[PDB]
């Protein structure tokens, strides 16, 4: 992976 | 929401640096947040040291961690940094902050403490 | 691992004046992006977060925009208040700092 995963919000 | 630094203002060189931050208006084990220790030497950039969550996961800077101990205790509110064989790089203003506002991990910082300056001299 | 890129160092502006600032990451980095404001003695102070986000009680001259690895930070209107020094910041990978700006005032 080279364009970055997505960062968890607080629900 | 207050925190405050509190540490020696002399340090010697070779010897352990240790500083306490104190947090008022929230708990620091609230799984909602995280912990960390930014330093800043004179006159040059802000660095993070280290973050430190509830369960005991931390996050360290890789160019300290060999140094680094932070910790949390849930009795008095307050968490700690250790910094093992100090020299004159060392010497900065170390500031506490809380951070996780609104990722589920370390984000920005909001807010900080006042700063403690620690002066590594013999 | 990350490394910010922060332009200029310092700057000098008179009253009213456009101020900008740039900070490249080196590794892509989404809006992960924090602009943070310091005055001399004082910890720095949050003023926008995730690249583009005001904070509350933040002026609406400061400003930001980007995403990837180029990020500009903006003071529309340069006042005497805003005198101090800028540090952007990304959480893509850890914590990261710019080299930070100094700002200063032509009068």
């Known amino acids: 992976l080279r364009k970055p995963k997505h960062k968890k919000l607080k629900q | 929401l207050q925190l405050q630094e509190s540490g020696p203002g002399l340090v010697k060189p070779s010897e352990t640096l240790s500083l306490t931050c104190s947090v008022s208006?929230?708990?620091?084990?609230?799984?909602?947040?995280?912990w960390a220790w930014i330093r800043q030497p004179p006159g040059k950039a802000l660095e993070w040291i280290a973050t430190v969550y509830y369960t005991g996961r931390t996050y360290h800077n890789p160019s300290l961690k060999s140094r680094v101990a932070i910790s949390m205790d849930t009795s008095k509110n307050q968490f700690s940094l250790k910094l093992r064989s100090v020299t004159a790089a060392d010497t900065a203003v170390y500031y506490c902050?809380?951070?996780?506002?609104?990722?589920?991990?370390?984000?920005?910082?909001?807010?900080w403490g006042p700063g403690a300056l620690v002066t590594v001299s013999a | 691992d990350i490394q910010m890129t922060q332009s200029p160092s310092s700057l000098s502006a008179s009253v009213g004046d456009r101020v900008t600032i740039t900070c490249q990451a080196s590794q892509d980095i989404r809006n992960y992006l924090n602009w943070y404001q310091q005055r001399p003695g004082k910890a720095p102070k949050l003023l926008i977060f995730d690249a583009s986000n005001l904070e509350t009680g933040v002026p609406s001259r400061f400003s930001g925009s980007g995403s990837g690895t180029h990020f500009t930070f903006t003071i529309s209107s340069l006042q005497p208040e805003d005198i101090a020094t800028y540090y952007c910041q990304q959480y893509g990978e850890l914590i990261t700092f710019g080299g930070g700006t100094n700002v200063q005032m032509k009068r």
């Open positions: 902050a809380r951070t996780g506002i609104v990722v589920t991990t370390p984000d920005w910082f909001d807010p």
């Open positions: 208006g929230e708990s620091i084990s609230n799984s909602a947040y995280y």
